[PDB]
Design a binder for this molecule. Structure first.
Ligand SMILES: O=C(O)[C@@](O)(COP(=O)(O)O)[C@H](O)[C@H](O)COP(=O)(O)O
Ligand SMILES: O=C(O)[C@@](O)(COP(=O)(O)O)[C@H](O)[C@H](O)COP(=O)(O)O
Ligand SMILES: [Cl-]
Ligand SMILES: [Cl-]
Ligand SMILES: [Cl-]
Ligand SMILES: [Mg+2]
Ligand SMILES: [Mg+2]
Ligand SMILES: [Mg+2]
Ligand SMILES: [Mg+2]
Ligand SMILES: [Mg+2]
Lengths: 473, 473, 158, 158
C-alpha cells in the first residue's frame, strides 16, 4: 500500500475506519457520485483522519460512533478512496442512495458543500470537481429548453448571441427600461436581460415593465425584421410572487420563444430553479449567480469551484448560467477556471478539472454515444430525437465588464462561439448611446467572423471606430 | 476633512464621486440600510476608489458611467459615508428604495453581498454588520411564531429547550427514525429535529416517517405527561414538493404546536424560507444553515458574518436559526461571532458588532419602546398585544458536537438560557443509548440550574456519571 | 412468418434510459417486438414513468429509420389493482400509436383476477400472459398440479 | 476454504462466478432477502454451477453473459453464499433493491419462485425458508386488522 498510508490507516478510530476504503474496487460502477476536494487539516487530526471526519459528516455519520448505527446504514457511508498528499487533495465516493428522491439538487449540496464547510478540523475545504454516473444522471431533470431552441427562434447561428443588460442597475422606471431594450434590439442586438436586482420597485411596477417591453420588442422586431429575446428577472420574496410574475409574462401575448426567465440561483435558491424548470420547461431558464464569490473565489480556502456550480446548474435544468469572462472583464479570474466550466456545460464529453464527464444516461461505450460525441464536436445539434441517451447542454452566459474590443480576446480563450454574451456598460456607455453601442458590438462580431482586425473593419464602420477610441483611450 | 481623506476624494472619477458622501448629514434618517464591510483593494485602486466601485455595483452603477442614467436614478446611489483605514472598514449607506417590494429578502442580499463578492478589484470583502431603520423593518415580515409560543405549548421555561437530532445522519428507515424520536422524548428530551439532509430517500418513505413520528410522539407524551415537538425537514426539490410535505404533517393530525418545519435555508434558498413563513405563519420555522461556511468562515476573506446571516433570518421570519457553539463544539468558532449574533436575534436592543440595533418599527425614544426594552432585559415576554411596536424574537439553535459536559461552558459564554440546544452525537453515542443520553442531558441542565458542579450532581445520577466518564475520555 | 422479438436484458439493473436503448437497438436491427423481462417494473433506478417516456421516443425513431411499425409489451404487474391501472393509464396517455403497445401480466403470481381485469378494462390492447411460477403446477417431476395444455386453455378462456 | 468447495468454485464460468460469494461477509447487513432452497442439479451441471445459474435467473442474469450488462446491474446480482451438500441445500442472498416498489409481493415471488421452477438444470428446487431484514419489512404493509381486533369485537379470549 505504502508505509505512510498503512500508518495513516492504522491511525483511524472504529468510526473513521468506516468512512475509508483506499482499496475501493470500482468507484465509476454507478453506485456513487464521485467528489474531489482541496483539503487542509485544522490541527489535532492527520490528513486521513480529517478526510474520514469530512466523509462522515457529509453522509451518514457524526463526531462520535452512535449506538443507533445499523449495518444497513453503513452501506450508505461515503468513503475516502484516494488522496494526493502533495497537492492536498481528497477523493470521496458518495452513495447516491443518500440523496432525496424526485431529483432534489439542494439535498446533494446539503451533504457535499454543507455542514462540512464549517468544521474547525479543516483550514481549507474547496470542492473542485464531481462525477455524475449515468445511473444517477437519470434520476435528475437536466435542461428541457436549450440555446439550440433559442437559436432556432432567433435564427442566429455560427456566432455568439449578442446581448445587453439594462443599466442603470436600478433607478430607471418601467417606461425608461423599455426604451433601453428597444434601442439595443433595434441597433442589431439579439438579447436583453434584466439586471439581477431589477424587479417590482415602487417606481418600476413589474406589470408595466412587462407591457412596455412587449410593445418595444414588437417595434424592434418589425423595424429590424429579426426576432428578439428578453430574459426577465423572475426572483421574488416567495414561491407565489415568482409564479405571479411568470404568469404575467406568460399571459402578456409574447410570441413563444421570445421570453426567458432569469433567477438568482444562489440567493433565491436551488428550489426556485427547479420549480421554474418543472413548471416552465419550454421557457429558457437563465441562472444568474450573484453571491457565488464566497464559494468560488481563489482567495477563499472554503467553498466550491465554478465547474461544480456550472455542473449542478446543468443537472438542475438551467438552460443557461453565467460562467465568467476568464478574467478578461471586471470579475475574477481565469481561462483555467472559467473555460473548463463553460466546456463542462457546453459539450457532451469534457475533461474537466479532475473527472472526465460524458453526460449520458446510457454507457459511453455504445456506438450511438460515441457518434453523439463526434457529431457534438462537429457542431451538429444532437438529442432532438434521442433525448433518453444524454443530458442536454447548459449554455454559458459571458458577462462582466466586457465591451466590443474584449470580444475577440474572449472567443480566443473560449475556443468556440456557442455562448451568450451580455454587455451593459460596454454598450450604454458608448459615446452615441445604446443604439450605437449595439452596432459597435454587432460590427466587432462581423469583423471576427470575416477574419478581420477590428481596426481594419472600423475603417468603414463608425460605431466600432468610436468604440475602439472610447474603450481604450 | 483631513489631509489623507482630502487626497482620496480628489482621486475619484466623476462616476466614483457619485457613490461617495463622507459628509452624509444623517445616515439614520430612515432612508438608508447602513452596512459595514471589511475591505482590502486588489491592485490599481485605492481604498476610496474600490469602495466607490463596490457601492456602484451594489446599487445603481456599473464600471463606466452610462448614457441611460437619469437624475432620479442618482437619488438611489449607495454612498460611502465613513472609513477606518487602520481597521480596513468601510461604511456604505444603501437607500432601501433600491429593494424590491413585498418584503423580498433575497433581493437585499443580491445587492449587498452579490456580484460585488466576485469583483477582481478587491482582495477581501466581508459584510460585518447592517442597520435596519424602523421604516424599512415595517416593509418586512419578521417572525410570526416564536420560541415564546413553543415554550407555551411545551410548558418549558427558565432553561434551554433540550433537543436532539436523529442519528445516523442517513441510513435509518422511517420506523427506525421514529424509535430514536420516542427514546429521546421518553428519556426527558423536549425537542427532536430531522438531521438536515433527511427527506424522502427510497428506504425511508416520508409518509411513513411522518405517521410513525405521530404515533411515537403520542406514546412519549402519554408516558411522560409532558408535551413534545418535532422539527421536520421540508426542504425538497421544488416548491410543490415542499408544500405537499408540509401539508402531510398538517393532516397527520398532530396537536397544534407539536411540529415545526425545518428548511436548509442556504441551499434550499431564501425564497423557500419566506414561502414557509407566509404559508404557515403559525408553525415554528427552523432555519438550518448548512453551506454558510463559504460566506461566514473567518479563513475566507470574502463573504459576510454570522451576525448578518442571523439578522436577515429574523427579517425574513425564521422562528429560529442556528448560531453556533462559540467554538466549544465541532464548528468554527468564537463568542465574539456566535454570541453577538445570538444576542442580535434574541433581544429587542443589541450592540451588535458596529451598529446598535433596536428592532422597533417605531422610534426607539418613545417611552413605550424604552419599557419594552427594560422588560426584555428582565426576561418578560413582550409583543403579545403590541406587535406593531417591534419585530419579534428569532431563536438561537445551538448545535454541533456538544455533549452534557459542554452545556454549562456554552451557557457561561451565552449569558442566558433562552435558546434551543440539539445534541445528536452527545445523546445517541451515550454508552446506555438514546434514553440514557437524554437523561444525562436533562441531569446536566438541572445541575446548571441548581448551581451544582456536574461531577457532584452525578454522584446520585448514573446517566450523567456515565456521560462524564465517556465524553471526557 | 413468426413475430421476431426480444426481452430487454439484464433481467434487472438497467435504468429507464438504458432500457430504452436496448429497445431501439433491437427494432432498428430489424426486430418487431420488445417485452419487459417479467420482474421489470417501478424499481428506484428505473422510474416506470420515465421508462414509458423513453420507450415512446426510442420507438418513434426506430419506426422512422426502418419505415416499419414496432410493438412494446409493458409489464403491467403491480402490488395491487389501483397501481396496475395507474401503469396502464400512463401508457394509454404517452401517447403511442394504437397497436404499438401490449400489456404483460405475471398471471400466476399476480393472479387470474389481474388477467381478467386487463381483458375487460383494456379489450383493444394485446394481453400478454407471462407464466412465471407455473413450474410448480406443470413440471413433470411434480406428481400434483396441472398440465401446460390446461394452463394455456384456461388463459384462452380468460 | 476446503478442497471440495475450491474445485466447485473453479468449475464456474465468467457468468456463474458473478452470482457466487461463499465469502459474503455479512448476509444480515440489511441489503439482502436471504433464501434457502432444497436443490438437486439437472445433469451436466454440478451443485454450484446449478446454484449460480438459479441465482442468475432469479436476479439480474440470463443463460449467456450479455453485451448490455452494466457495472451497476452487477450490484443487484443474487449471490450463493452457503451450501450443505449432504442436506442438498443452497443459501442465496437477494438484494431487496431488485423488488418492485410500493411493497409489491407478486414481484418478490416472480423472482425467487418463478422462471427458475421450469428450468432444465434442476430435478428438485424447493424454497424452504426466507429471512426479511428490518429495512425490508418497513417497505411492506404487514397486517392492519388482526385477530386481537376480532377477539375484542367478539369478547373471546384465552
Ligand atoms: O451586474 C453586472 O455587473 C452584470 O450585469 C454585467 O454588467 P456589465 O456588462 O455592465 O459589466 C452582470 O450581472 C455580471 O456580469 C455578473 O457576473 P458573472 O456573469 O461573473 O456572474
Ligand atoms: O449534522 C450536524 O453536524 C448537526 O446535526 C449536529 O449534530 P451533532 O450534535 O451530532 O454534532 C448540525 O446540523 C450542525 O450543528 C449544524 O451546524 P451549525 O449549528 O453551526 O449550523
Ligand atoms: Cl483502506
Ligand atoms: Cl465626500
Ligand atoms: Cl466464492
Ligand atoms: Mg447585473
Ligand atoms: Mg445502441
Ligand atoms: Mg446536522
Ligand atoms: Mg407611545
Ligand atoms: Mg423473463
Amino acid at each position: 500500500m505504502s508505509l505512510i498510508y498503512e500508518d495513516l490507516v492504522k491511525s483511524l478510530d472504529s468510526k473513521q475506519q468506516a468512512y475509508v476504503d483506499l482499496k475501493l474496487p470500482d468507484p465509476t460502477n454507478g453506485e456513487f457520485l464521485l467528489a474531489v476536494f482541496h483539503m487542509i487539516p485544522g490541527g489535532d487530526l492527520n490528513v486521513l483522519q480529517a478526510a474520514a471526519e469530512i466523509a462522515a459528516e457529509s453522509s451518514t455519520g457524526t463526531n462520535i460512533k452512535v449506538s443507533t448505527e445499523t449495518a444497513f446504514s453503513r452501506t450508505m457511508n461515503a468513503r475516502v478512496y484516494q488522496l494526493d498528499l502533495e497537492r492536498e487533495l481528497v477523493w470521496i465516493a458518495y452513495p447516491w442512495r443518500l440523496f432525496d428522491r424526485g431529483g432534489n439538487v439542494q439535498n446533494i449540496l446539503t451533504y457535499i458543500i454543507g455542514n462540512i464547510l464549517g468544521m474547525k478540523e479543516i483550514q481549507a475545504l474547496k470542492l473542485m470537481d464531481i462525477w455524475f454516473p449515468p445511473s444517477m444522471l437519470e434520476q435528475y431533470d437536466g435542461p428541457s429548453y436549450t440555446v439550440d431552441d433559442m437559436r432556432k427562434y432567433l435564427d442566429v447561428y455560427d456566432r455568439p448571441i449578442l446581448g445587453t443588460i439594462v443599466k442603470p442597475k436600478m433607478g430607471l422606471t418601467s417606461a425608461e427600461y423599455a426604451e433601453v431594450c428597444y434601442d439595443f434590439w433595434v441597433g442589431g442586438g439579439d438579447f436583453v436581460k434584466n439586471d439581477e436586482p431589477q424587479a417590482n420597485q415602487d417606481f418600476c411596477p413589474y406589470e408595466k415593465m412587462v407591457a412596455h417591453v412587449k410593445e418595444a420588442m414588437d417595434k424592434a422586431v418589425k423595424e429590424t425584421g429579426q426576432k428578439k429575446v428578453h430574459s426577465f428577472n423572475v426572483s421574488a420574496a416567495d414561491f407565489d410572487t415568482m409564479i405571479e410574475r411568470c404568469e404575467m409574462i406568460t399571459n402578456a401575448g409574447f410570441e413563444p420563444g421570445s421570453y426567458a426567465f432569469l433567477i438568482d440561483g444562489i440567493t433565491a435558491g436551488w428550489m426556485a430553479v427547479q420549480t421554474l424548470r418543472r413548471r416552465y420547461p419550454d421557457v429558457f431558464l437563465h441562472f444568474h449567480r450573484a453571491a457565488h464569490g464566497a464559494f468560488t473565489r481563489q482567495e477563499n480556502p472554503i467553498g466550491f469551484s465554478v465547474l461544480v456550480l456550472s455542473k449542478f446548474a446543468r443537472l438542475a435544468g438551467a438552460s443557461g448560467i453565467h460562467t465568467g469572462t476568464a478574467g478578461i472583464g471586471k470579475m475574477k479570474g481565469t481561462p483555467a477556471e472559467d473555460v473548463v466550466a463553460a466546456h463542462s456545460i457546453q459539450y457532451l464529453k469534457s475533461p474537466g478539472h479532475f473527472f472526465e464527464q460524458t453526460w449520458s444516461k446510457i454507457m459511453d461505450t455504445d456506438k450511438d454515444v460515441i457518434n453523439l460525441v463526434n457529431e457534438d464536436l462537429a457542431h451538429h445539434v444532437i438529442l432532438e430525437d434521442d433525448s433518453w441517451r444524454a443530458m442536454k447542454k447548459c449554455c454559458p452566459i459571458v458577462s462582466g465588464g466586457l465591451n466590443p474590443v474584449k470580444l475577440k480576446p474572449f472567443i480566443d480563450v473560449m475556443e468556440n462561439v456557442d455562448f451568450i454574451t451580455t454587455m451593459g456598460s460596454g454598450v450604454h456607455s458608448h459615446p452615441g448611446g445604446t443604439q450605437s453601442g449595439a452596432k459597435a458590438l454587432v460590427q466587432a462580431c462581423d469583423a471576427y467572423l470575416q477574419g478581420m482586425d477590428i481596426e481594419e473593419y472600423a475603417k468603414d464602420h463608425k460605431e466600432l471606430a468610436e468604440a475602439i477610441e472610447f474603450y481604450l483611450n
